[PDB]
Amino acid sequence: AALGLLMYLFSLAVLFTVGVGVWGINIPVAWGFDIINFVWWIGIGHAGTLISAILLLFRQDWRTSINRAAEAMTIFAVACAGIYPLVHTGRPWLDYWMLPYPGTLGMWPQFRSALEWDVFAISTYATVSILFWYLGLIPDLASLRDRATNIWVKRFYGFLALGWRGGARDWNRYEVASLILAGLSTPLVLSVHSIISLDFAISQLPGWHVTVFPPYFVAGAVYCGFAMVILLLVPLRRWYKLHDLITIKHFDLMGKVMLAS
Amino acid sequence: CQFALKQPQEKIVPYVRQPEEIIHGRPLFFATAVTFAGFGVGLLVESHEGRPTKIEGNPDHPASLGSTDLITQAMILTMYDPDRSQAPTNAGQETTWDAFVAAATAAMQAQTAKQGAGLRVLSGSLTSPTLIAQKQQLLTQFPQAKWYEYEPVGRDNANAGARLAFGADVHTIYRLDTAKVIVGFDADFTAPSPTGVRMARQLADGRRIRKGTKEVNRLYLAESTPSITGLLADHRLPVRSSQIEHLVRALATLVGVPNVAAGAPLSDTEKKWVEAAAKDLQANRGACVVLVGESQPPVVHALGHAINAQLGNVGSTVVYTEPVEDDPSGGIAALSALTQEMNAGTVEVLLMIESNPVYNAPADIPFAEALAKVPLSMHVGLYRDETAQQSVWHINGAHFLEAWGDVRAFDGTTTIVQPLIAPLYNGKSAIEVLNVLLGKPQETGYQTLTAYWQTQDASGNFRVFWNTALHDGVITATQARSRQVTLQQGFADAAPPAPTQGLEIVFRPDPSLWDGAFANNAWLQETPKPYTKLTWDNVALMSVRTANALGLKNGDVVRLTYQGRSVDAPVWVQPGHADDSVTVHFGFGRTAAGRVGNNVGFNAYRLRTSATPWFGVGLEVAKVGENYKLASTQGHFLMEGRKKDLVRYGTLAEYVEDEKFLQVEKEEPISLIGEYEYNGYKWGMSIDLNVCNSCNACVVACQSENNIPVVGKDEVWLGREMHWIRIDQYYVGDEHTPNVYNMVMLCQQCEHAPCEIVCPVAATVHDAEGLNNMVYNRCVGTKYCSNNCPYKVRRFNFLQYQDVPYRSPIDASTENDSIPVLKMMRNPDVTVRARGVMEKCTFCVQRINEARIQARTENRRIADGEIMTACQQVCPTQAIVFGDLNDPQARVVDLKEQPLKYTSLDKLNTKPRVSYLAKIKNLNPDLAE
Amino acid sequence: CHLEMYDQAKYKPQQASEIFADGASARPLVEHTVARGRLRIDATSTGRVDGDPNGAYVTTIPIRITPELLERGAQRYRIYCAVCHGVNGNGRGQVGLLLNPRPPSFYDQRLLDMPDGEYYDVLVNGRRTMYPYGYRVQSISDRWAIVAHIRELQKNP
Amino acid sequence: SMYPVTYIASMLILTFGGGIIALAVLKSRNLLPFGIPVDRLHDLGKFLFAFVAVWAYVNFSEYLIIWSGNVPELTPWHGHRSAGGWEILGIVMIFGHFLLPFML
Amino acid sequence: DISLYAGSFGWFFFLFFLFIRLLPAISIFEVRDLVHKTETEKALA
Amino acid sequence: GGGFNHQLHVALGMDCRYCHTAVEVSAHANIPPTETCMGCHSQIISRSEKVAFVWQSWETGTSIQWNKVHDLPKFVYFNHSIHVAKGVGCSTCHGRIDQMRVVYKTQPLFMSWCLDCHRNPEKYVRPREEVFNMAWTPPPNQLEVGRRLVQEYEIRSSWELTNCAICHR
Ligand code: HEC
Ligand code: HEC
Ligand code: HEC
Ligand code: HEC
Ligand code: HEC
Ligand code: HEC
Ligand SMILES: CCCCCCCCCCCCCCCCCC(=O)OC[C@H](C)OC(=O)CCCCCCCCCCCCCCCCC
Ligand code: SF4
Ligand code: SF4
Ligand code: SF4
Ligand code: F3S
């Protein structure tokens, strides 16, 4: 995985230095792998929150074992999807221009193009599926801290789990913060891959202006996402001895939600 | 990747002594001309501050009525070409100029004891009056010296067929102002030929379809290779080019010419074309013409005058005059006459001025090996050509924007070539070189130019004439006077030979690269060839029938073996082409062109014969290749049912009966997205596709004006050509003989621009004047705008496209280092785009802003003809018309009301601001079906 | 910060050059060329009887002196000449008092009978000490308007 | 497309809004065979609320698509339903259909 | 494009293998529940 | 060398168009050549080390390499002769050049400053005649006098003047 990262940071150092045109993108098709993999990688991350957040609405319990192995699967599928809209631009250094800021020249981002909603969907999807994931960790990082029996390891998790303490009232504030965040990451990922759906459907192209892209890109993101959840849990269930937690009924139900999508 | 907390301390250098004419920040157009084939074109070049920047046509010149050619437009890069010669080379070793005069005047004193016996000269078909007059001083100071004129493409047959039919030599001047029926056999007259611009406008001026037009030219073309005349041709016929020589003999027997004695029966469809043409020339006798191209043998040009004088075209349409060039008896026969003299060691001083025959030799005339059999062989060329590799001396060229010379266009209208800049490298042009041979070395070019024109000016003063000659450029006082002719018959009494069977290689000059003298020009090389949109490749074009016979594709690499010599050429199937015949392009494979045309393969000059120099029937194809790149820009060459959105076609048979016969009646389309009002200047364009002959001069005019970067062939095959304006061939139906239509595609400047709502940082926005503003600096390179653009006009600087033939764009060590010589050809009011920045045809805002601001400064409004876009005043046919739409008396708002007016892709309401006119193509009743 | 197109490979109206010996990017015009708008062979564009350099000068101003041109002349004379010939033409400009062959005042009999050609000849080609103007005025309308104002300065000594 | 999908998202408002309506008329008159648990009535309320959000997600995205790229073949639907008085029923869909029963 | 997409799985698994080793790869208190919920349902039966 | 103090030179009565002749006629306000500086300094203070740099530029063909202080980014395409013609005096963009021994930037050329007068010219538009009058302080009622000069000059609206093509051509 690290040698694959050295291929990542070298295909980026070659891209920044030589240009965005080492990609084989033509002028008719200016959007190639850089956007096929952006919509794919962000599509993977959407069924990691359908497990972590959308199933919390339905109060279902086949989500508990597959919670973090999918919620943390979202973030790292956004950390590889949040780079393509920051790197497929021909001038990546001016990617702060897609953000609203008083910047000594009266230009602001457009707010009519879905590449301007993307930087508002991807940046929200990042810093909400990170906080909802870090929220789901403070109780666990308190379990890792109390069971560490190793100074500077107990301090590491003791610093991440801020002061968790358990708590009768700290758990009620958690149950409402986790429900509302689940109730906010349900329309978020219904809109993040719907906004990513709209960087095709607002164009007058024949194969792109299909109006049913929002409830079909979302359905495609949940479709490709559960495939990646299964691809990453069959090894985590087999190699890591988690047969007593991620039971085969989780895959029976993930295979059905991957079918309903 | 450049980065800095502050941009460097940019310096402001003023003049040391500012001229009384240079106002900093203003174009200051000049008036010069360019020797294309010895004949002038009459330019009007943008001289910003001493240096030229943009070449435009001189509206007072007959050879170019305000619009330039394709080669002529891109010859501002040929000047600002870093591969241009910068110092003379003595035997390859770089040397000074004053060392040449030491060893050139020492050769004249060695050529004076002998009465100038070995002072042969190989200029190429010069018509310059001051160069003719110095040729006269050289041939009387050295009486035995000879001056062989060799141009590889020039009038070798038309000038030898003119004296074959008339006795003495004549110079015909075809006029298409009054020509209802043109029948030009192999006539590529709307071509880079010296009369190409005028014969494109005078032919387009006949097919100006309007609200009430009923009579239009017909132009029967009869040509083996589809050419830029076949676009305007209404009945083009793919002929073998061996039948043309007796396809005119059939027309010269229907028209009554006494002793033609035709032979070699034609065809079922070539004969039906020659009866319908002759039955169309007998009607409207006085207003018609029978043109003949250069590829035909001299006996055909003799018949071209046998029919023109039979239809009474003399004095009306065809005008014979005194020969503008000095001697028309030179060319392929004069090159062989000198080469047989260079053999056996007769030549001692061989000044090859601009011909470059070591490359241009027909491969039967062994000039490469005949050279170096002489002791002293000079050369004065702007590029170190394949002769400079083999010649002893090589004087720098002094490109025509740096040389004090003159030209003489067709009909004799001399134009003083006017140096805009002093030569970047020490020039020493053809006049400053003969001054060394004549014996007056220290006498500059301007000194001899007035020392000749003070003799030729007998009327009035000189400074009232010389400056008026320099201001207008056109002197129009040496107009070639008419000449009574006789047309002595019997020239066709010789029977035509037995028709030879076999595939025929027809030798053709390349539209873009004429004869290889401009192969290092990256602008007219990246420019796509007209019918086959290839850019950096010479190919063997075959018809679809004569390639399915050989089992050939669009990418194979055949080995054309014609009379012993093999060339190993690619292949590109061309639907309009003729059966069992291939064509070639002149001037591609140059071992020493420079850094641009240095290895663009398939040198087609090594297949000629000097007896069959334009077409021959002894070819063996025998494919020996599998796959080639063949970077073409278009892609699909078929109107995929998308007529009414692409170029709409029709015919005058159904235009007189219903003017609005292709304007679809559609209701006002509903648009949720507001509506904005443009009460200021409403900048709109009206293209007339009826007259867009794909000259590709508008493609280079947008490059010369908008600093558009050349792209390598490796990145054009990837579909990354930077061309804001493109012409689209579409090949409707019957892939053996398809009609071909052009829709020159540029940025429509859509009012409901879909490419604007899709820029995240809001770079590309619309204007209050009404044209999509691409802002190259706010562009972060998202490149989404092209995907929303319905026409895919927006081109993206994917890599650092800048000086690309001089630095491969896939590097980055030099992508911030710019060639200092190239920085001058760039327009000082158009952004030189970096990488990662999309661009598009901006209606030349560099011309709208500089003219509106000049209008607001003077508190007046913009005149109708004051803002001409770069592609509008370069189109010879004047297809593109740009102007205010709110000005009711404008040539656009009176041109968008025509019944042919339509916009591309009106099914999606972009409200395009350019509105093409349909292609009405005047079919004959008894020839169509 | 990113200098992408802050410095471009093109020569703006004034900036240094790395190809020419005197880095200018503004090359001198070739000596005897005539531009499209600058003919300068008549009695108007040069103050000579027919444009000949060995001509006889022009006694009256060739262009029609409209009343809106004298206010253009008095404004142009106040720019160029007045800094060194004085605002009222008596050669007492703030710089004129510092030139060693002090600029000759008007209103003296030497410069009244001097024709409008000389007043234009020195305005375009200068004198033995006055450097050539006309690359500063650069417009025949304002070139003769200055001569017109000096023609009316001498109307009140 | 998504014209048959914007009905599906509105088929689920009627059958859930009707589900709470019919369960209330049966419980107001005391006709139900089971007392409605106040936490599972909150489930029908969460379904009804989530489907006003889905309905506004499918009707607006159908409009945001057709409005952005206004191809005159997809436009005449929202064009005729935004002019001549139909915009009064259009601004009710934005405020009285989504924004009022989303805040409530 | 291949050396960036196939290298993007590096940046995915560089973080996903760091998450497994550093953080609990499966929720603990959410699996403490559904164990307290299974005993609460087994209590009635 | 020498530096060319404007304060000393304009104090001699130089009307700011003696040098910079191409203003009010061209897009680029030109810098005077060596012949202008040598128009007086051929005998004013010749043989002085302060002015021996125009003589070094007059005898030698080299032109003076003036350091540019107002450095626009070459993709913006400023245009004089339309600010000077529409009543935008030489101040308010260059500051008081009459009190500048060395020319420095006064307005930082932000494009929030160029658009500030393009979106609202009445706050800075002055009479056409008092453009080269550097002592021009805006009146207390700059608006409703600059508002009146906008219709007098027909200066275009904030919608036509801030639309990506005025600048950035
Ligand atoms: C200071 C640099 C001057 C400027 C500004 C102008 N003039 Fe001048 N002028 C100057 C000098 C030092 C002289 C003396 C010439 C000599 O013989 O040394 C002059 C002279 C003239 C003359 C008379 C020439 C003659 O031979 O009598 C004229 C008619 C004249 N100057 C005109 C003139 C005009 C029109 C000017 C504005 C463009 C102008 N001068 C400016 C110094 C200077
Ligand atoms: C006549 C109108 C002049 C023009 C044209 C130029 N300068 Fe000048 N300069 C002039 C005077 C009368 C003086 C002062 C005389 C004295 O004895 O000091 C100057 C002085 C300078 C200086 C020195 C400044 C100081 O304080 O000593 C410099 C550096 C200078 N001038 C530069 C300069 C340049 C670069 C010019 C061309 C743009 C130029 N001067 C023109 C009068 C005139
Ligand atoms: C000749 C004596 C001049 C007069 C009169 C005026 N200016 Fe000037 N200016 C002159 C020179 C030789 C230079 C370049 C030298 C330097 O120090 O920069 C300038 C420069 C400017 C600039 C800045 C140009 C830049 O590099 O960005 C400005 C803004 C300027 N000048 C303004 C200005 C004004 C308002 C004037 C009338 C009072 C004026 N100049 C007169 C030469 C001369
Ligand atoms: C704001 C609209 C301005 C007004 C009013 C004046 N100037 Fe200017 N000036 C301005 C800018 C933004 C720049 C730099 C732009 C560029 O690309 O150069 C300048 C620059 C100059 C220069 C130097 C130009 C160069 O060397 O390239 C000069 C000589 C200059 N300005 C003179 C000048 C004068 C005399 C003015 C009063 C009429 C004047 N400027 C007004 C902005 C503005
Ligand atoms: C107020 C003092 C201004 C500042 C600051 C800038 N500009 Fe300006 N500009 C101003 C006026 C009153 C006008 C006249 C507009 C008209 O149509 O008459 C202008 C005009 C221009 C133009 C040309 C207008 C056109 O029709 O193309 C340009 C190119 C321009 N201005 C450029 C420009 C730049 C780049 C500026 C920032 C450095 C700038 N202007 C500032 C007033 C003012
Ligand atoms: C004249 C009033 C302008 C108008 C209209 C527009 N721009 Fe501008 N722009 C102007 C100036 C003087 C500058 C220089 C600012 C600086 O920092 O020196 C700019 C710069 C920009 C930039 C920055 C480019 C960079 O490489 O940093 C951008 C992105 C830009 N301008 C965008 C922009 C757009 C999109 C405009 C039309 C909607 C536009 N500008 C108009 C002057 C003027
Ligand atoms: C993956 C990222 C995106 C996440 C999702 C989206 C959320 C975005 C949240 C807001 C963050 C946006 C960051 C944009 C930074 C733009 C600054 C910039 O690029 O300056 C450009 C220029 C080269 O720089 C300059 O001109 C000046 C350079 C020096 C200052 C650099 C400051 C950079 C900030 C770091 C602060 C370091 C301290 C600096 C100390 C002083 C340094 C001299
Ligand atoms: S529009 Fe283009 S292709 Fe057509 S004639 Fe003009 S320049 Fe040539
Ligand atoms: S025609 Fe293409 S480039 Fe031009 S405005 Fe429309 S979408 Fe943009
Ligand atoms: S208007 Fe000018 S820039 Fe636009 S396509 Fe035509 S030539 Fe090119
Ligand atoms: S969509 Fe946007 S930022 Fe650049 S290339 Fe295309 S414009």
3-state secondary structure E1-45: CHHHHCCHHHHHHHHHHHHHHHCCCCCCHHHHCCCHHHHHHHHHC
Query: Which amino acid, one-letter code, is at B742?
Result: N
User: How many angstroms separate the alpha carbon of residue B914 from the centre of ligand 9?
Assistant: 10
Q: How was this structure determined?
A: cryo-EM
In the block, which residue shows the tokens 């805006």?
A: F138
Provide the residue type at D11 as one letter.
M
8 Å CB contact between B487 and B165: yes
CB C96 within 8 A of CB C152: no
What's the Cα-to-Cα distance from B772 to each of B682, B786, B856, rounded to whole Å? 12, 13, 22
Phi, psi of E16, deg, nearest 5 = -75, -30
Amino acid at D51: F
d(C-alpha D96, C-alpha E15), whole Å? 46
Three-state DSSP state, A91: coil
Using a CB-CB cut-off of 8 Å, the residues of chain C touching A92 are none
- Asked if residues B236 and B246 have their Cβ atoms less than 8 Å apart, the reply is no
Please state, in angstroms and rounded to a whole number, the distance separating the CA atoms of residues B912 and B904. Answer: 7
Give pairs for C146-149: CB < 8 Å, separation 24+.
C146/C73, C146/C76, C146/C77, C146/C80, C146/C81, C147/C47, C147/C61, C147/C73, C147/C116, C147/C119, C147/C120, C147/C123, C148/C61, C148/C65, C148/C69, C148/C70, C148/C73, C149/C70, C149/C73, C149/C74, C149/C76, C149/C77
State how beta strands B504-508 and B581-585 pair.
Answer: parallel
E strand map for A70-161:
none
Q: Which residues contact B520 (CB under 8 A, 6 or more apart)?
A: B78, B81, B83, B383, B590, B593, B594, B595, B596, B597, B598
A56-85 burial, b at 16+ Cβ within 10 Å, e below that, comes to bbeeeebbbbbbbbbbbbbbbbbbbbbbbb
Rounded Cα distance between A143 and B66, Å, is 85
- For C24, which residue in chain F has the nearest alpha carbon? F63
Residue B761 is nearest to which of A26, A27, A98, comparing CB atoms?
Answer: A98
Model resolution, angstroms: 3.5
Q: Please name which of B747, B256, B357, B384 lies closest in space to residue B587, comparing C-alpha atoms.
A: B357
Pocket test for ligand 6, best of C1, C3, C4 (most atoms within 8 A of CB): C4
**Full domain range(s) for residue F142:** 1-169
Q: Where are the alpha helices (DSSP H) in B514-658?
A: 523-526, 545-548
> Tokens 């004869």, residue?
B515
Ligand 3 centroid to residue B492 C-alpha, Å: 78
One DSSP character per residue, A201-220 reads HTS--TTT--TTSHHHHHHH
Q: Is A61 on the interface with E (CB under 8 A)?
A: yes
Neighbours of E43 (CB within 10 A): 7
Tokens of A52: 């972590």
Neighbours of chain F (3+ CB pairs under 8 A): A, B, C
* Whether the Cβ atoms of residue B412 and residue B479 lie closer than 8 Å to each other: yes
Burial of B407 (0-12, 13-18, 19+ CB in 10 A): buried
Helix (H) or strand (E) holding A7: helix A2-18
Which strand (E) or helix (H) includes residue B616?
A: strand B615-616
Identify each DSSP E strand in B327-417 by its residue range. 349-352, 376-379, 405-408, 414-417
The residue of chain A nearest to residue C5, with distances taken between CA atoms, is A91
State which ligand 3 atom lies nearest to the alpha carbon of F98.
38
Q: How far apart are alpha carbons A114 and B759 in whole angstroms?
A: 9
Q: How far is CA B735 from CA B151, B576, B731, in A?
A: 36, 7, 7
**Residue A14, amino acid:** V
Q: Which of B206, B188, B207, B186 lies closest to B196 in space, CA to CA?
A: B188
Q: Determine the Cα–Cα distance for residues F18 and F12; give it in Å rounded to an integer.
A: 11
Q: Which two tokens stand for residue B111?
A: 């050529």
Cα–Cα distance for residue pair C7/B223, rounded to 1 Å = 50
**Contact between B573 and B501 (Cβ < 8 Å):** no
Cα-Cα-Cα-Cα dihedral sign, residues C3, C4, C8, C13: negative
Residue C146 near ligand 1, beta carbon < 6 Å: yes
Dist. CA E36–CA E42, nearest whole Å:
10
Contacts of B507 (CB under 8 A, 6+ apart): B295, B583, B584, B586, B604, B607, B608, B613, B614, B615, B616
Q: Half-sphere exposure (CA, 13 Å, Cβ side) for B591?
A: 11
Where do breaks (C to N over 2.5 Å) occur in chain F, by preceding residue number? none
Q: What single letter denotes the amino acid at residue B911? A: K
Cα separation, B705 vs B712, whole angstroms: 20
CB C138 within 8 A of CB C40: no
CA B732/CA B735 separation, integer angstroms: 8
Q: Is F166 in the pocket of ligand 5 (CB under 6 A)?
A: yes
Whole-Å CA distances, B62 to A81, B202, E25: 62, 11, 84
Strands B405-408 and B880-884: unpaired
Which of C72, C80, C85 should be mutated for ligand 1, with most atoms under 8 A from CB?
A: C85
When divided into structural domains, chain F yields a total of 1
Minimum distance, in Å, between the CA of residue F114 and any CA atom of chain A: 9
Distance CA B292, CA B348 (A): 39
F102 contact C CB<8A: no
**Torsion sign (Cα): B824, B61, B743, B697:** negative
Name every protein residue with a CB atom under 6 angstroms from any ligand 7 atom. Answer: A 96, 99, 123; B 3; C 1-2
How many Å apart are CA B370 and CA B602, to the nearest integer?
Answer: 23
F141 among the known binding-site residues? no
Residue indicated by tokens 């850089």: A34
Looking at residue B648, the DSSP 8-state letter turns out to be -
> Which ligand 1 atom sits closest to the C-alpha of C110?
27
Q: Cβ–Cβ contacts within 10 Å for residue A172, how many?
A: 10
Q: Is C137 an interface residue toward F (CB < 8 Å)?
A: yes
DSSP code at position D94: I
Q: Are B431 and B403 in contact (CB under 8 A)?
A: yes
B328 closest CA partner among B358, B298, B285: B298
Q: What backbone phi and psi angles, to 5 degrees, belong to C36? A: -75, -35
